[PDB]
Each structure stands twice: as C-alpha cells, then as structure tokens.
C-alpha cells in the first residue's frame, strides 16, 4: 500500500498466496509422516537459531550502537 | 460380586543433600581485590588510550577459557558451586514420576474398594430396585456375615487396602531435600484415606446406639437405616420395632413386612410391631433373653427403635442389653448416652455424624476421642413411603 | 512458614523446580519432565541478552 | 427412575406437576438415571493435579482441527 | 524321519546410557562472553592493522593445542561431551552382531521344525504319492499317537522350539539405549513365531467341530481333511461317514476305502457309509457308546460329517458327544456352534480360519478370545477325485 | 512417533548409526561393521573442504 512498485505488489500477493498454502500442506503432511530424529532436532534448533539474533537487530533499529560509539 | 484386594507398597526414600558450609571471610576479601585489579587495569587502559594497551589489557587476562573448566576445582578449594543443580533437578523429577506411579496404583485400588463397598452398600435412594439384589444377605457366620449385621449409615473416609510401607533410610532432617520430603509428606497425608466411601455401623458390636441432634436429622437417618435393613435383610432374618410418642412420623412403616408380627394377625395381615410406649410391650418374647455379648446368630435380630423418652427402659434394659436385639435411641437421653462409642452426634446442620473412630474390619473402637465419622444419608418421608410401597409388593 | 523467614539455596532451587514443573503442567498437559524445552529457550533468550551486552561493551571501547 | 422434560431436565419428585409447570398437552421423558455417586479422586501434588484436570476437561489441538485452520 | 529339538536361549541385555543433565545458564553467558572477547581482539587487530598486532593477536590465544586434550575436563566441569560417541557405537555394533548370531540360530531351529512338520503333514496336493509313506500312523498311545489323531488343516504361525529366556538386568526406561532396546523389542516380536507352518487340529480334544463360512470354502476344507485322513490313516484305524442333502458334491468319496462299510457288501464291494439323513442311520453301532472324554484308543475312530441341517442330531448327540466318534458340522448351526473352541470360522474370502489359540503340545485352549488360526488348505473336487482314484488302487 | 516431536541427541546418533549400517548393507552385502571406510573417506572429504576454507581465509588477510 505504501509503495507503488508493481514488483512489490507481485511479491506481496505471492507471499500471501503461498505461505498459508505452505502452512496447509504442512498441516496435512506432518501429523501422518514419520521423521528422522536428525530432522526433528534440526526443527528444534531452527527455533532457537531464529530466536537468538533479535536483540542485536533491535539495538540496530534503535541505533544504540551508533549512539554509544559516539558518546 | 465385585473384587477387592489388599496391597503393601513401600514408599520411596527421599533425596539427601549436604548443607552448604559457607565461604570463609578471606574469600570475600580476595574477590574484592581481584575485582579491584580488573577495574584498575581497564581504567589504566582507558587512561593510556593507545590501542596496543587496549589490546594487551584484554589479551593477557583471558583466563575464563580455562576457568570455565577450572570451576571443577571449586569443590576442592571450597568456592561457591551452583553447578550441581541439573543433576539434582533430574533426581527430583525421577523421584516424582515414581511417586506418580504409586499414586495411580492407589487410585485403581481405591476404585476397586469403592465399587465393592457401594455394591454391598447402595445409597438409600437407589434401594427402590427392590428385586434381584434384595434380601440377599445371609445368617451364617461365614461369608455374608462380614456384611450381614452391618448397615451403611453415611459417607466418609476410610483407610485404603493398599498399605504404605515405611520410607526406610530417611535422611536426617538437615540432609532431607525440601521438595521430595514435602511431596512424600503430602502423599502420606492424602493417600492415607479414600474419600466419600460408604460409612458403616455394625449392629453386632454395640448393645445400642443413641442419636443426638436435630429431630428431622435423626428421623431422616432412622428412615434411611430402616429402609437399608429392609432391602438388605429379609423379614425372616431381621424384625423391626418402633416405640414412639408421634406415630404420624412413623405411619409409613406399616407397609414394610419386617414390622409384621407373625404371631398376631389382623385384617391387613400381620400385626404391625409399632408401640406407643415401652409399657406397651405386650411381646415379652424379646425380653426373656440374657445380657448381650457383642459378636466377634440369633434367629431374628430385633431392631427396636425408641423416641418415647421413657424412664422405664432402664428396667428391661440393663447396662449391657438384650441378646438378640440391638436398640436405637432416638431423642438422645443420659440413659442411653452412657457410652460415647454408641452416640452418633449430628455436629453440623447437614448431618455430619461424629463418633469414635472404629476399625474398618473388626468395628471395634480404635481410640476414645470423638472425631468426624460420616455425613448421614438422610432420607425424606416420601422416599421412605415410596420404597415401602415397593417392598409391600413382595412376599417371598 | 509465613513471613520473610530465611531459606536455603536448596529450597530456592527446589521452588524453581516446582515452578517449572507447574509451568509445564500449565502450557502442556503432561508432567513427564525428562526433557524440558522451556529451559532451553530461556537459555536462548539469555544468550540474546548477553550477546547484546557484549556488543554494547565492544561499542564502548571506541573513542 | 425420573420423569423428565423432553429438553432433558428431571422433575422434582417432591413437587407436583402443577408447580413445576407441567401443563396439558406437554410431553415427558421417563428416564432411569444411573447413580452418579462415587469416590472423589484426590491428587496432592499441585502440578499433577493441574495437568490431569486440564487434560480431562479441555480439548487439545488435533490434526483434524489443524487442516481446517490451514484452510481458513 | 526328521529330527527336531527344543532349545532355551537367554536374550542379551540392552545397553544403558545416562541421560544428559543439561548445561547451566551461566555456561551460556560465559560462552557468549568468550566469543565477544575473541571477536573484540581480532577486530582491534584489523583496526590497528600493523602486522605485529596481527601476529600477537593470534599467537597469544593459541590454546586449542592444549584444549584438544583439556576437553577431558569437560566431564569434570560439566560441559558438552559428544566425544563418547565412538565407544557407544562400537557397543551397539557388538550387541547387534550377537543378536544376529541368535537370529541365525533361530532360523536353523525353525527350518528343522518346518522339515519335521511338513514330513508329518504334507500339503493336500502332494498326498497323491499314495505309497511308501501312506497309512503309516499307529493306534498305540506312544510315539505316533503324538500325530495319530491330529490333522493338518492349514498353514499359519506357531511358537518355535527355541525358548527365549528373559533379557535379565534390563536397565530402567530412562537409561535404556534406544537402538538396542528397539532391536530387542523387534526380535522378541518377530522371532516369537515361525511363519507358514502346517496348522493342526487334533480330533481327540473336541467332541465335534462346526464349520462356519462360505459353502465352497467349507466343502474344500472338508475334502482336504478327508483326503489327509485317508492318506495318513488306514481304513482299519479310521472310518468315515458323510451325512448330506447334496450327494452330488460327495460323489467322489465312493472310491475311498475308508467309506467302505465292512458289514454290508454289494456288487461294488463294501457298502459306502454315506447317508442322506441323520434318520438314515441304520448303523446303530456308533450310537451305543457313552459320552466322550477328550484324550490326554477306539478301534475305528469314526469321523461323521454332516451338512444335512437336521434338528435330529441333538437326540443321538448330547452336549458331550459319543466315545469313539468325532463330528464335523458343515453348514454351521446354533446346535453345533455352542462351543467357540469348536467353531472354525472363515473370516476372509481366501479361507482364513479364525478360532481359539491352542497349545502346540496339548491342543488345549490357551485363551478364550478368537484369533487368527490358519489359512485353509482348500482342495478342489477334481484333485480329491484324482486322489480317490489313486487310493482305490490299494487294498492292504 | 509421527510428526515433528522432539528427539534426544542419543537418538540422533542412533539414527545416524542405523543410516551408516544400512548404507554399508546397500553398497556392500556384509554388515559386519567393526571397521568402516565410509566414515574414513567422508572425513577425507571434510578435510578437503576445511582446507579450502582455511586457504580462503588465508587469502582474505591480504590487502
């Protein structure tokens, strides 16, 4: 809505139609399939790995690093 | 019929933990000195400002790369050691799961006991089945005699058929780990009893009972007792007598065949064994017996119920009673209340009976202090009359 | 045991254990506790915070 | 035995038809209510009691629900 | 004749493994701090740029040259220790090879059992040998009596002659190593039985059997039974009777000498013991016996087969049967199906018999629940007729 | 055990072991596993990749 780029529009409609469709496919597949213990541990670790870096990124957004490098 | 089984289960031994001794005073001085050195070094790096010094001042004191391992010597030198936590938490969890397994074993045992007791002792309302399971208890001193002379009076606690063997090897009270110790305390406290089972009175162990409380509580319980006996025991095994000053409250009992006197006949059938005074005993057949010995079986076991409040009972009733007859003193008086083990006292308006704790098995008093016993299965006059109209249908 | 009476560190960990076990009984409906992801991810949070602190110090050294 | 209204509720045996509002042309259902009295369970440990009460009384997520959520 | 031997083999004990306790929270803080120092040092080397600093910043922190050994203190301080893996993997492999040795021992035992059973119980098609091994089973209660009164009815599972002794010293379920535990579960599950051996019915343990299912399934099985008995047992030991409403289906049996009545002679030889009604019993010689006791030997053991669907059997047949005679009720009726241990029920179109599990040795029922028993060795009318034309050639 | 449920590291190595044993049963037709060259040569691959990485870093330091 803010940007008027048609490429942005195409990316937005693409993610809106694929990502919940991917969720549907995951909901249909996952409870019926077996899985390897390695893949299961990978899926656990995906959580922690996507959880950890959000505080340095947040400090990036406040520019606390840029403020403290020059205070 | 249902099944029930006793069990014995030893409770597990709680965890032990050595109490921390506390760090010596010099260790605190050393810690403060170490921090003083660290801040002095970094401060002189800031004051010196050259990037060489800022490198050197961090490069040489990197010791934590080994010190993370050297923490293991904390238990040698006596520093603080919080790091044993994970193993202890695993031990706690393990013990707790073991306790859960014991708890579910207690649950299934208690369910078995419940099913058995309620099979032997249906609630008064449910007695309107009046066929199939009716009058099925037996005289003879084996088998059914475990429940021949016993009546459900209420609901309450009882000790389970599982027996908790002692948690042997208890650590001393300073070594006792708080969680597992407290949990085991609570297990012993609450798995000590099964709640809301039928509470029973045996007619064979006291010469009489005396009922102290509000009038309709006492009456409602009495009607419940009468209908329990009438369903469970046939007229050929148990006969009933009511001695009253208020026969309108007792007009429902006329239908019950157990009140039928086999000796006198009238238009309606057998004579009703309801008398308006103790002087109105024109029986003299229940009054030629000797004193009563409590059972550890007479042909009918007469149950005589009195709310006449007459001083003349103490003539035909000694301090010990009559052989084949048990008594129920409604309107509790000092004549009948001379034995606290015989007094069922409505302490709370709902009909909470207190009396003495008795052994589940022998019905013998275990200790002399009055305690919570049951909440009475009080029953209305209409339900009693309805059951009586059911029981009147049968003649076997 | 009312009031602000003293308590030992073994009781501190014993309470924290019962708190975690109750939290697991609350969010999940199982109490078999042989592994516990709650701890693992709060450790991941701790890693996030300590990394932000470390980088903040590494930012302080510039002048 | 109970007489019940067709909506399910048992009538009071101590009350007449009139004051519990039975009227002409109504319908009633003659049930035999099974006795629901039994021992009260007791779990002493707070955590285990929470877990079993919730598991007994509420419904977990299930793949049947999950596919509908994905479709929504 | 072949050989077979029982064995007893204790299964090996699975591996045990202590569950990891999990690292304490401060260890994660320390790790992050250590990485922060490392990146700070190298960063200040890049910012300082002089090759001296770039040397120093790598030269002083080379600690891994010792730390590769100092990993051994990980088990002291409680760090992560993945390095025990090779030893555990060796233990796993070793245990697995031991299990393979046990499996091949089970294989050779099962092969021996198979060879024995099929020697005693050839498939119906193969019975056309009709000489050499024919009629070789014996009356007398020793030896051949283990297979004198028993008939192959199908193929299916049986328990092996190896007996799996318990894997004693099982670790607790948290210590139990996943691979070896699961493998041992699967071994116990699948080496529990030998698949596709001859399934046997003993004629000496039930007074009758009743055959429930589709008509041609039942008939095909019946023809198979008859030809099995005719090959295995001589006419002097086993005699046969068919009582039918549809003699065209039973026209092939005329050739079999076991149906020959020795008492009545006609042009073709001995009279055929095939009757069109239970009322057509003009024998009266198999009907003067007493009730039957199941064996734990009569001169001929009469086998009477009925698909007449007549209520008159219950007169000459009590609830217990006749002494020297076993019965086979084709067209399963409530009269004959009063004992589930006697009912062979075709549950699947191919001829899957379900009945009660019986002991391999005593033929006695082990438990009351109906279960998979066999797939029936059904045989066509043409094969039965062909075998009958073979058997008619012999008179010994 | 369907779905994406949790698994312990001892199960991760237990599966990787069964994967290697099945791979050896597939390429060779023996499962006696007292020594295994599969591991040895994938370690040689790992040595190749780590050496290329190291030399790539050693290339980065020039300016």
What is the number of other CB atoms lying within 10 angstroms of the CB of residue B268? Answer: 10
Distance separating alpha carbons of residues B104 and B108, to the nearest angstrom: 6
HSE-CB of E195 using CA atoms within 13 angstroms: 3
Non-local (6+) Cβ contacts of B169 within 8 A are: B13
CB contact under 8 A, C37 and A54: no
Q: Please report, for chain C, the start and end positions of each structural domain, with discontinuous segments joined by +.
A: 1-63
Contact E216, E377 (CB under 8 A): no
Experimental method: cryo-EM
Is the CB of residue E76 less than 8 Å away from at least one CB of chain B?
yes
* Contact between chain B and chain E (3 or more Cβ pairs less than 8 Å apart): yes
Token code pair at residue E87: 């030893």
Is the CB of residue A27 less than 8 Å away from at least one CB of chain D?
yes
Contact E33, C56 (CB under 8 A): no
Chain F's closest residue to A26, CA to CA, is: F3
Q: How many residues does chain A have?
A: 71
Neighbours of chain D (3+ CB pairs under 8 A): A, B, C
**From the CA of F29, how many Å to the nearest CA of chain A?**
24
Chain F's closest residue to C37, CA to CA, is: F6
Selecting from F2, F6, F11 the residue whose C-beta is nearest the C-beta of A34 gives F2
Mapped onto helix, strand or coil, the DSSP state of residue B363 is coil
Distance separating alpha carbons of residues E273 and B223, to the nearest angstrom: 75
**From the CA of C43, how many Å to the nearest CA of chain A?**
9
CB contact under 8 A, B179 and C17: yes
C-alpha angle C23-C26-C31 in degrees, rounded to nearest 5: 75
What SS3 string covers chain E? Answer: CCCCCCEEEECCCCCECCCCCCCCHHHHHHHHHHHHHHHHHHHHHHHHCCHHHHHHHHHCCCCHHHHHHHHHHHHHHCCCCCCCHHHHHHHHHHHHHHHHHHHHHHHHHHHHHHHHHHHHCCCHHHHHHCCCCCCCCCCCCCCCHHHHCEEEEEEEEECCCEEEECCCCCCCCCCECHHHHHHHHHHHHHCCCEEEEEEEEECCCCCEEEEECCHHHHHHHHHHHHHHHHHHCCCCCCCEEEEECCHHHHHHHHHCHHHEEEEEEECCEEEECEECCCCCCCCCCCCCCCCCCCCCCCCCCEEEEEECCCCCHHHHCCCCCCCCEEEEECCCCCCCCCCHHHEEEEEECCCEEEECCECCCCCCECCCCCEEEEEECCCCHHHHHHHHHHHCCCCC
Distance separating alpha carbons of residues B152 and B155, to the nearest angstrom: 8
Distance separating alpha carbons of residues E366 and B281, to the nearest angstrom: 66
CB contact under 8 A, C21 and D47: yes
**Which one of F10, F15, F18, F22 makes the best mutation probe of the A interface by having the most chain A beta carbons within 10 Å?**
F15
């Amino acid at each position: 809505l803010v940007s008027g780029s048609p490429a942005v529009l195409s990316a937005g409609v693409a993610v809106l139609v694929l990502l919940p469709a991917a969720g549907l496919t995951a909901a249909a597949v996952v409870p019926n399939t077996i899985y390897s213990p390695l893949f299961r541990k990978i899926v656990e670790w995906i959580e922690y790995l996507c959880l950890m870096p959000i505080f340095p990124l947040a400090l990036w957004l406040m520019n606390v690093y840029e403020a403290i490098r020059y205070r | 019929a249902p099944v029930v089984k006793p069990e014995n289960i030893v409770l597990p031994t709680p965890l032990s933990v050595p109490p921390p001794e506390g760090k010596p005073w010099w260790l605190v001085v050393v810690g403060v000195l170490v921090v003083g050195l660290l801040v002095g070094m970094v401060g002189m790096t800031v004051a010196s400002g050259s990037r060489l010094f800022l490198g050197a001042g961090a490069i040489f004191p990197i010791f934590m790369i080994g010190g993370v391992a050297m923490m293991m010597f904390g238990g040698r030198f006596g520093g603080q050691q919080q790091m044993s936590r994970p193993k202890l938490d695993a031990m706690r969890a393990q013990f707790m799961l073991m306790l859960d397994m014991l708890r579910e074993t207690a649950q299934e045992s208690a369910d078995s006991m419940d099913a058995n007791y309620r099979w032997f002792h249906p609630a008064p309302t449910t007695l309107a089945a009046a066929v199939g399971s009716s009058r099925m208890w037996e005289r003879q001193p084996d088998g059914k005699d475990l429940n021949f002379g016993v009546v459900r009076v209420g609901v309450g606690m009882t000790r389970p058929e599982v027996t908790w063997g002692e948690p042997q090897n208890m650590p001393t009270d300073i070594e006792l780990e708080p969680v597992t110790g407290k949990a085991l305390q609570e297990f012993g406290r609450y798995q000590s009893v099964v709640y809301n089972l039928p509470k029973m009175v045996s007619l064979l162990v006291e010469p009489w009972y005396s009922l102290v409380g509000e009038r309709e509580q006492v009456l409602g319980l009495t009607r419940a007792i009468i209908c329990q006996l009438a369903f469970s025991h046939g007229p050929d095994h148990v006969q009933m007598i009511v001695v009253t000053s208020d026969p309108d409250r007792w007009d429902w009992v006329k239908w019950i065949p157990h009140f039928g006197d086999p000796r006198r006949r009238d238009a309606a059938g057998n004579a009703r064994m309801v008398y308006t005074s103790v002087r109105e005993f024109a029986t003299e057949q229940a009054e030629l017996f000797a004193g009563r010995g409590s059972f550890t079986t007479p042909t009918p076991h007469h149950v005589i119920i009195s709310d006449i409040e007459d001083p003349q009972w103490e003539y035909v009733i000694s301090s010990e009673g009559v052989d084949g007859v048990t008594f129920f003193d409604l309107t509790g008086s000092p004549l009948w209340t001379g034995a606290p083990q015989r007094v069922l006292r409505f302490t709370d308006s709902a009909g909470v009976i207190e009396t003495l704790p008795r052994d589940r098995d022998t019905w013998m008093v275990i200790d002399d202090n009055a305690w919570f016993f049951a909440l009475a299965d009080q029953m209305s006059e209409a339900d009693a009359e309805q059951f009586a109209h059911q029981m009147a249908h049968w003649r076997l | 045991g009312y009031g602000l009476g003293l308590s030992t560190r073994t009781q501190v960990t014993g309470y924290q254990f019962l708190a975690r076990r109750t939290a697991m009984a609350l969010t999940r409906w199982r109490v078999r506790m042989e592994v516990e992801p709650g701890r693992r991810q709060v450790l991941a949070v701790v890693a996030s915070v300590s990394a932000a602190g470390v980088i903040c110090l590494g930012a302080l050294l510039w002048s | 035995w109970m007489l019940c209204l067709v909506d399910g509720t048992p009538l009071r045996p101590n009350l007449s038809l009139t004051e519990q509002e039975v009227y002409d042309g109504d319908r009633l259902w003659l049930k035999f209510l099974e006795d629901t009295e039994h021992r009260s369970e007791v779990i002493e440990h707070i955590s285990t009691a929470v877990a079993t009460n919730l598991s007994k009384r509420f419904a977990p997520i299930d793949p049947v629900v999950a596919v509908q959520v994905g479709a929504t």
